[PDB]
Write a protein that holds these residues in place. Structure first.
Motif, mmCIF file in Angstrom:
data_model
loop_
_atom_site.group_PDB
_atom_site.id
_atom_site.type_symbol
_atom_site.label_atom_id
_atom_site.label_comp_id
_atom_site.label_asym_id
_atom_site.label_seq_id
_atom_site.Cartn_x
_atom_site.Cartn_y
_atom_site.Cartn_z
ATOM 1 N N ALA A 44 -5.374 -3.219 17.844
ATOM 2 C CA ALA A 44 -4.113 -3.947 17.925
ATOM 3 C C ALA A 44 -2.954 -3.088 17.432
ATOM 4 O O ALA A 44 -3.144 -2.168 16.636
ATOM 5 C CB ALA A 44 -4.195 -5.238 17.124
ATOM 6 N N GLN A 45 -1.748 -3.395 17.914
ATOM 7 C CA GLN A 45 -0.565 -2.644 17.516
ATOM 8 C C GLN A 45 -0.097 -2.983 16.108
ATOM 9 O O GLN A 45 0.652 -2.200 15.514
ATOM 10 C CB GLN A 45 0.572 -2.889 18.510
ATOM 11 N N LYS A 46 -0.517 -4.122 15.563
ATOM 12 C CA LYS A 46 -0.125 -4.544 14.225
ATOM 13 C C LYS A 46 -1.075 -4.045 13.144
ATOM 14 O O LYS A 46 -0.920 -4.423 11.977
ATOM 15 C CB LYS A 46 -0.028 -6.071 14.161
ATOM 16 N N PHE A 47 -2.050 -3.207 13.500
ATOM 17 C CA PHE A 47 -3.021 -2.725 12.525
ATOM 18 C C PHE A 47 -2.453 -1.655 11.603
ATOM 19 O O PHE A 47 -2.971 -1.475 10.496
ATOM 20 C CB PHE A 47 -4.258 -2.178 13.242
ATOM 21 N N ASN A 48 -1.408 -0.946 12.030
ATOM 22 C CA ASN A 48 -0.798 0.116 11.241
ATOM 23 C C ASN A 48 0.525 -0.314 10.615
ATOM 24 O O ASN A 48 1.410 0.521 10.398
ATOM 25 C CB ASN A 48 -0.600 1.363 12.102
ATOM 26 N N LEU B 62 2.721 -2.243 12.067
ATOM 27 C CA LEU B 62 3.714 -2.485 13.111
ATOM 28 C C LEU B 62 3.581 -3.922 13.616
ATOM 29 O O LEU B 62 3.174 -4.191 14.748
ATOM 30 C CB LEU B 62 3.555 -1.471 14.243
ATOM 31 N N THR B 63 3.936 -4.853 12.737
ATOM 32 C CA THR B 63 3.860 -6.269 13.058
ATOM 33 C C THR B 63 4.993 -6.671 13.994
ATOM 34 O O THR B 63 6.105 -6.142 13.923
ATOM 35 C CB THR B 63 3.913 -7.115 11.785
ATOM 36 N N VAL B 64 4.695 -7.619 14.877
ATOM 37 C CA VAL B 64 5.659 -8.131 15.845
ATOM 38 C C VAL B 64 6.097 -9.517 15.392
ATOM 39 O O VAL B 64 5.273 -10.433 15.285
ATOM 40 C CB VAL B 64 5.067 -8.172 17.261
ATOM 41 N N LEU B 65 7.392 -9.671 15.126
ATOM 42 C CA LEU B 65 7.907 -10.957 14.675
ATOM 43 C C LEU B 65 8.229 -11.852 15.869
ATOM 44 O O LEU B 65 8.748 -11.372 16.882
ATOM 45 C CB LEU B 65 9.163 -10.768 13.828
#
Ligand SMILES: *[C@@H]1O[C@H](CO)[C@@H](O)[C@H](O)[C@H]1NC(C)=O
Ligand SMILES: *[C@@H]1O[C@H](CO)[C@@H](O)[C@H](O)[C@H]1NC(C)=O
Ligand SMILES: *[C@@H]1O[C@H](CO)[C@@H](O)[C@H](O)[C@H]1NC(C)=O
Ligand SMILES: *[C@@H]1O[C@H](CO)[C@@H](O)[C@H](O)[C@H]1NC(C)=O
Lengths: 24, 272, 85, 45, 49
Positions: free
Chosen positions: A6-10, A12-15
């Motif tokens: 997933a892109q939020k694993f590093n 880089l969370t998506v709000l």
């Protein structure tokens, strides 16, 4: 909605936005 | 111990073309639905590759000492299990740590030692009169050994010792690499019905076990097995047979390749 | 062996902090780790009984404070961005 | 009035048949953000 | 700045008055309290009895 795509694993969370697709 | 051969009429090796061959797993991790590229030693597609024959019907027996480069591709459309093992080394005079990986009829041995490799080591299969079965009796791979350290036994594998002259039914690919002294073996069996001009199919190669010896390899040579029936007198000078086999010797080049990963996680396509 | 909590493990190749959820995909019997489309090692095979487990971090986002404004109130509220309760 | 009403219904069916067969302005804004997020994870390597 | 979220809003914004709106003070990181290290499954002891 199905035509244009997933892109939020590093950290880089998506709000989420203020208005979802149902209110638009 | 080994014996010498007699000069005879041979056949020169030919040059054929490969068709989407030489693709293995570049790592030990799982990938799914991702198009990732890496820089490893692979085989370029539509390249010129050598071709050596092993069919008797004449008397074709060509096993030279080819130089071992950084990664090789050994594909064999094996039918009757004629090719037994492979040897490695630099000078082959009991001076360096020579390798001996021979697939026997009882168990697979991996013994890296200082064996006395002769000019041409080969295993002989003698046919008994009272017993209707092909048994290996001439175990001529080396002369003696003084002292070595590493010795490892692999899993047992059953082989067929009977040699025929029909068409091939299986295909075996072997990839030997050497990075930082570590040895890699990529083997995978795939059934096919063809005698030459390999198809355009795709098949991945899975490794079995890493062998951390830590030596340098610059030359290699394959081992071929012959049969001794009642038609031949039994001498290894001018009368012998070898069945039918065909192995391909290819050199892996440092080229980047793009692989395709499905939901299962296996390699589907390769793009140079 | 513990699961379903934000734990820390060292499976011979990495030291990651997260949870261990039960996956539904079986790996090939020659690999140990697993990447994804975003190039992140989030699947490490357990060498105990060959149990495939996924890795999900426990720190997602941050906190948020809601203030109604001056001369209106005195209490606030704590809002989590991507943290489940 | 029956002619323009039939031409209006034929214009809607032509747009629906053309859109069912991807867009450009709604895809470059997502592909540029997807490649930028995939670049930041590559910066850690 | 480490006692009340209302006081955390004023020092992080560097203002003694707060209007209506959303703000971000700090982050929430979950610290693990246990750690496990299991390289093998079972250490197969060679026969030494
Ligand atoms: C490969 O993926 C398909 C699609 O979900 C699945 O049905 C099948 O069981 C998978 N094969 C293996 C060996 O996991
Ligand atoms: C009281 O609230 C009003 C809002 O109606 C504001 O204008 C005023 O400044 C507040 N008083 C003080 C002392 O802040
Ligand atoms: C949050 O956690 C609770 C309890 O652990 C669980 O019941 C709930 O499904 C979780 N929320 C989501 C969105 O998964
Ligand atoms: C570790 O041992 C257990 C039980 O002895 C076995 O089930 C498991 O497959 C082993 N893991 C290996 C050999 O990787």
């Amino acid at each position: 909605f199905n035509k244009v795509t997933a892109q939020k694993f590093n950290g880089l969370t998506v709000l989420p936005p203020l208005l979802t697709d149902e209110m638009i | 111990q080994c014996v010498n051969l007699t000069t005879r009429t041979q056949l020169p090796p030919a040059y054929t073309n490969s068709f989407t061959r030489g693709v293995y797993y570049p790592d030990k991790v799982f990938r799914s639905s991702v198009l990732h590229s890496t820089q490893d030693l692979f085989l370029p597609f539509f390249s010129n590759v050598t071709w050596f024959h092993a069919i008797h019907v004449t008397k074709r027996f060509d096993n030279p000492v080819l130089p071992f480069n950084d990664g090789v591709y050994f594909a064999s459309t094996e039918k009757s299990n004629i090719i037994r093992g492979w040897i490695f080394g630099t000078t082959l005079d009991s001076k360096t740590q020579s390798l001996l990986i021979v697939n026997n009829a009882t168990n697979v041995v991996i013994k890296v030692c200082e064996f006395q490799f002769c000019n041409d080591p080969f295993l002989g299969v003698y046919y008994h009169k009272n017993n209707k079965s092909w048994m290996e009796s001439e175990f001529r791979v080396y002369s003696s050994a003084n002292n070595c350290t590493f010795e490892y036994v692999s899993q047992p594998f059953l082989m067929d010792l009977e040699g025929k002259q029909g068409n091939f039914k299986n295909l075996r690919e072997f990839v030997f690499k050497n990075i930082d002294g570590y040895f890699k073996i990529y083997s995978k069996h795939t059934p096919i019905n063809l005698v030459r001009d390999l198809p355009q199919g795709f098949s991945a190669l899975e490794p079995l076990v890493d062998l951390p010896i830590g030596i340098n390899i610059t030359r290699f040579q394959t081992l071929l097995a012959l049969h001794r029936s009642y038609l031949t007198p039994g001498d290894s000078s001018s009368g012998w047979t070898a069945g039918a086999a065909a192995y391909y010797v290819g050199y892996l080049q440092p080229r980047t390749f793009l692989l395709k990963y499905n939901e299962n996680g296996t390699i589907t396509d390769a793009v140079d | 062996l513990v699961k379903n909590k934000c734990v820390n493990f060292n499976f011979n190749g990495l030291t990651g902090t997260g949870v261990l959820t039960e996956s539904n995909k079986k790996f090939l019997p020659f690999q140990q780790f697993g990447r994804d489309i975003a190039d992140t090692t989030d699947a490490v095979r357990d060498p105990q009984t060959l149990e495939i487990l996924d890795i999900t971090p426990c720190s997602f986002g941050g906190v948020s404070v809601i203030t109604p404004g001056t001369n209106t109130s005195n209490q606030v509220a704590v809002l989590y961005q991507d943290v489940n309760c | 009035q029956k002619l323009i009403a039939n031409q209006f219904n034929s214009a809607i069916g032509k747009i629906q048949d053309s859109l069912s067969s991807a867009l450009g302005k709604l895809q470059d804004v997502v592909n540029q953000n997807a490649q930028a997020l995939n670049t930041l994870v590559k910066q850690l390597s | 700045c480490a006692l009340d979220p209302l006081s955390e809003t004023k020092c992080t914004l560097k203002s003694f008055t707060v209007e209506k709106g959303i703000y971000q003070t700090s982050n929430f990181r979950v610290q693990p309290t246990e750690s496990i290290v299991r390289f093998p499954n079972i250490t197969n002891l060679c026969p030494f009895g």
